Structure formats: C-alpha cells, structure tokens
Amino acid sequence: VHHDGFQTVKATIDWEHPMFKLYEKAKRNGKWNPADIDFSQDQKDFASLTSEEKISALPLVAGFSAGEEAVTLDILPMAHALARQGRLEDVLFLTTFMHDEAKHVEMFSRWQQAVGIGQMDLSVFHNDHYKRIFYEALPEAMNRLYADDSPEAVIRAATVYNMIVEGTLAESGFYTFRQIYKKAGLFPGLLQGIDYLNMDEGRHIQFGIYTIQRIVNEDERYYELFIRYMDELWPHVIGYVDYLTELGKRQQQLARTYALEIDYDLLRHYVIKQFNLRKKQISRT
Amino acid sequence: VHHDGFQTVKATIDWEHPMFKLYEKAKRNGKWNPADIDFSQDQKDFASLTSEEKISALPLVAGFSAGEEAVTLDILPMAHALARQGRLEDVLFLTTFMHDEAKHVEMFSRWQQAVGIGQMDLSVFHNDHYKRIFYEALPEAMNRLYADDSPEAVIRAATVYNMIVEGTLAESGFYTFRQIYKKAGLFPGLLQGIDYLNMDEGRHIQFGIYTIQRIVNEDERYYELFIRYMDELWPHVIGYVDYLTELGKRQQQLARTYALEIDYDLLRHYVIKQFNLRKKQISRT
Ligand SMILES: CCCCCCCCCCCCCCCC(=O)O
Ligand SMILES: CCCCCCCCCCCCCCCC(=O)O
Numbered sequence A, B: 001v002h003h004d005g006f007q008t009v010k011a012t013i014d015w016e017h018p019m020f021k022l023y024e025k026a027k028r029n030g031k032w033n034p035a036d037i038d039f040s041q042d043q044k045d046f047a048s049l050t051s052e053e054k055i056s057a058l059p060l061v062a063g064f065s066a067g068e069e070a071v072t073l074d075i076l077p078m079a080h081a082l083a084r085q086g087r088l089e090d091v092l093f094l095t096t097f098m099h100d101e102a103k104h105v106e107m108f109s110r111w112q113q114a115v116g117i118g119q120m121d122l123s124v125f126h127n128d129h130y131k132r133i134f135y136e137a138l139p140e141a142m143n144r145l146y147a148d149d150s151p152e153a154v155i156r157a158a159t160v161y162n163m164i165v166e167g168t169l170a171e172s173g174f175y176t177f178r179q180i181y182k183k184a185g186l187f188p189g190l191l192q193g194i195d196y197l198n199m200d201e202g203r204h205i206q207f208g209i210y211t212i213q214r215i216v217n218e219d220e221r222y223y224e225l226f227i228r229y230m231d232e233l234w235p236h237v238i239g240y241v242d243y244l245t246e247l248g249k250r251q252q253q254l255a256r257t258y259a260l261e262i263d264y265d266l267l268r269h270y271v272i273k274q275f276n277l278r279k280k281q282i283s284r285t
C-alpha cells in the first residue's frame, strides 16, 4: 500500500524523540562483534569437564539460543506495525534492536560451535512451559500486529516480548550466568558475551517501557491490561524456572568440583523480583 | 504462528552460507555513524550560494531522502518472508541491511537540518515517474510478500528494490553527486556520507543478486521474469532521469559559478549502463 509522503522530505527526523535518542545510544554502545570474542579458553574449560559437569551448563544455553533466535524473527511485526503508523524514530531504533538480536544469536551459536556441541540437539531442555512462551505465545502476540495494531495488541506484544522474555527471563539468565560461572572462573568468552548482551538488553527493555507507557498515557485503563498480561504468563515463567532448578539440583557435580553454593532459592527470588519491578516501571497515571 | 524449532538449538548457524559471510562483512565495514560527520562547512557552502544556485542541489537530495526512507520501511516484508522460510543467515544479514538504511535516512536528514532546509518541503521535486517507483511500485512489490512469497513474488521484489532502486538509481545518484559537487569542492560532509552510503549499497545489491540468482538456479524460466520486471520499470527510471536533467538544464548558475561542464548526456549514459549491467549480473543458467 502506497506511501503518501516521507517525513524526511516534508521535514526532518524528530531529533528530540526519545526513540531517536535511544537509537543514537545504540549506535554508540553497539559496536561489539561476536566474531572478535576469544572462545579458546572456553573450549578447554568445557573439554576439562566430566560429562556430568558438561551437562550442567547446557539447559541455560539451550534456553538462550532458542530465545535469541525467536526474538530475532519475532520483532519484525513490531517494526512493521510502528512503520505503518508513521513512527519513523521508533523504526530507526528498532533496526538497532533487530541487529543486536542477530549478534546475540551469533554469539551463543559460536560458543556452541567452539566448545564442541554444535551437533548436539539442545531442544531436549525445552519443557512445556518454555515452549508455551517461546514456541507459541511470543510469535502469536507479535504476528497479531500484522492484522491488529490496536493499543491492546501493541501493549500485549511489548509485554510478552520486552517485559517478560527480555525484562524478566533474559535479565535473570544473565544474573544466573554470573552467579555460577563467573564465580567458578569458567567460560570467559561466554561471560564476555553475556556482558555485551546485558548492555544491549537494557535498551530493548527501555523501548518496551516507552511503548507501553505511551499507550497507558492515553487511557489509564490499559494499565490493567498490562498487569493482566504479565500475570497470564507468570505460571510459565516460574514453571520454566522450576524445571531448570530441578535439573540443577539433580546434577550437582559442577557445583561440588568448583565449590559453588549455587543458591537456587536466591535465583528464584531474583526472578520474582525482576517480574515485580518490571510491573513498577509502568506508571498507571 | 508457532515456531517448530530453532536452528541454533538443533544445530548451528551455517557458517559457510554466503549471506552469513555478507553479514560478517557488513559488521566489519558498517561502523560509520552519521552523527560524526562534520557538516559545518556544508552549512557555509550552502549559505554562500545564491538562491538560484541553492535550488540546483535540492532535487537530487529530495530524491535520496524519500528513497532512503521508503527502503527503510519497505525492506521489512522481505525480512519477514525469508524468516518464515527459515533462511536464518539471510535474516541475520538483513538486520545489517535495515540498519544501514536507517543511517542513510539519518545522514540526508542531518544535512538538510544543518544547511537550513529542514523546514522546506522537498516533495515538489518528485514527479509522476518518481512517485510511480517510490510511492507505489516499491511498496506494492514488497508488501505482496506478506501474502505471496512465491519465487515470482520474491524475484519481483528483489528486482524493484535491489536492482532498480539501489542498483540503477542509487548507484547513478552517487555518481552524479561526485561528478558535480566533488568537482566543485562543495559539500564535503555530504560527500563523505555519499562515500559511506556507496560502500553499504554494494552489500545490498549483492543480496539482491544472490536472491534472484538462487531462484533462477531452480528454474531458468525465472530469468525471463527478471528481465521483464527490469524493463517494466525502465520508463519510469528514465522519465525521472529526464525530469532531473531538464531541471539541471534550466537552472545552470551553480555550474557557471563553479565552472562545471556538467555532462547530462554522460549522466544519462551512466544510468543506461547501470541498468544494462545489473541485467548481466544475473546468469540465465
Ligand atoms: C535456574 C534459574 C532460572 C533463571 C532464568 C533463566 C532463563 C534463561 C533465559 C532464556 C531466554 C532468553 C531470552 C532472550 C531475549 C532477548 O535476547 O531480547
Ligand atoms: C541527473 C542525473 C540522474 C541520476 C539519477 C539520480 C537518482 C537519485 C536517487 C534517488 C533514489 C535513491 C534510492 C536509495 C536506495 C537505498 O538507499 O538502498
């Protein structure tokens, strides 16, 4: 369907737009390249482990590799919907969002290749709760935007993607990686990647907050929808956390070997804290 | 619609895929930031010009600003279509393609802001032929991909976007900018941007060649479709070139002032040469 005109012909970019400012920060802070990460010591760490210790790390990597790939594919309908609404600065920013996710997919896949598990199918560590979030609910909410870009639909898409997948699960997985392997001295290349990912993710979450708040600013009754959509997904968030916890409690050899009191009760509470504080970053008024 | 699984969980990125290699080159060669270009001398050059000389440069900038904005919006359906086909490496590459176009929009809009014409509506320099390409035919061909991702549809989309808009018009506009202003010593910041754009554009055109050739490799009869779709748009390509030429011939004060024998017959022949050589980069066999 035709373009009726172009903002940068009739006028200019809105230089003061919050998403233009976020785009500018993304360019400045987004230079890192996964191809430059030295994974040679990760290969050695992984080979040094027993099979039982090897396993310990794979469920979390399985969750991230699928998650990064899902969000790379599934952000495209948001870019389309805001493009069709004429929100040029949002779209400029989203090009950095999408390119970030591509690098995130690349990073975890390089690590798998380097440590020797590229040929292993890690889908076995996706339980029903994970699938409900990543194989179903996320693509459903985003793809809806192609035929329904109502405020309700945009709120739901940003809530599932930015507040739950990124702002609750991703943030907690970054924390979990540091709490376990940074402590152990293991996988320095992976943890360099996690640090870069965590920096990118901050901008993604801020886009989600901006998006949800500007819709809530129009009609405070959308605040109730945001809360409702957060709570709808919580059972799957915690059901996946519990599954990963149960796997950690059953395979403890990496913990013993490296003297890690991995506090699964603390990890759980970090997740609950992440979820509650995303809710508090949306002001009803 | 659900994900059935993820390539980077079951396996890895196809590291030898041509579009993964193009993505890798795009990251290495795509660091430039329009925000770092010094436009202070462009502001002075522009203010130094007479109104009659001022006008000379605006039609070409008008064509580029709209063109960059159109392609930023209109590449999204190609990313979607290849994503839904599972072409993960194409999608990774396309994130760099989209982010490039965002920077291109930003670059021309910064120049307009800096030289003092941000408030001027440059739509007056889009004639009917230009509109047919950029306001209509381009969005029609790309948006079709949301409901029709047949080889015919993908060939047509790549032909309009990558071979005509980028590989014929953009390439010729880069040449035109150098032939006129690089000669004059004018607008150094703009020409720094043009150089960066021309480097990015090379990767975009190569994606289009890859895309069209891999479909032609399946069924040589698609070669005829490629040629047919190139010829369908030629009248609008040359009709826009003629319009810009006629405007250049009527407002010649910048040429006289700066002693430029602007060879409009040469510019025209560069366009014809661009078009014919894009055709020859697709092998029927
Ligand atoms: C054992 C403690 C549980 C901690 C929670 C771990 C969750 C793993 C994260 C996997 C999904 C990652 C989503 C990526 C989204 C993005 O990159 O924007
Ligand atoms: C007077 C000689 C005519 C030369 C032809 C000039 C055409 C101007 C170009 C405007 C469209 C630019 C399209 C940008 C596409 C992209 O950035 O991928």
Ligand SMILES: [Fe+3]
Residues within 6 Å of the ligand: A071, A101, A166, A201, A204
């Ligand atoms: Fe993210």
Ligand SMILES: [Fe+3]
Residues within 6 Å of the ligand: B071, B101, B166, B201, B204
């Ligand atoms: Fe381009």
Ligand SMILES: [Mn+2]
Residues within 6 Å of the ligand: A129, A239
């Ligand atoms: Mn359960």
Ligand SMILES: [Mn+2]
Residues within 6 Å of the ligand: B129, B239
């Ligand atoms: Mn005509």
Ligand SMILES: [Mn+3]
Residues within 6 Å of the ligand: A068, A071, A100, A101, A104, A197, A201
């Ligand atoms: Mn990510």
Ligand SMILES: [Mn+3]
Residues within 6 Å of the ligand: B068, B071, B100, B101, B104, B197, B201
């Ligand atoms: Mn461009």
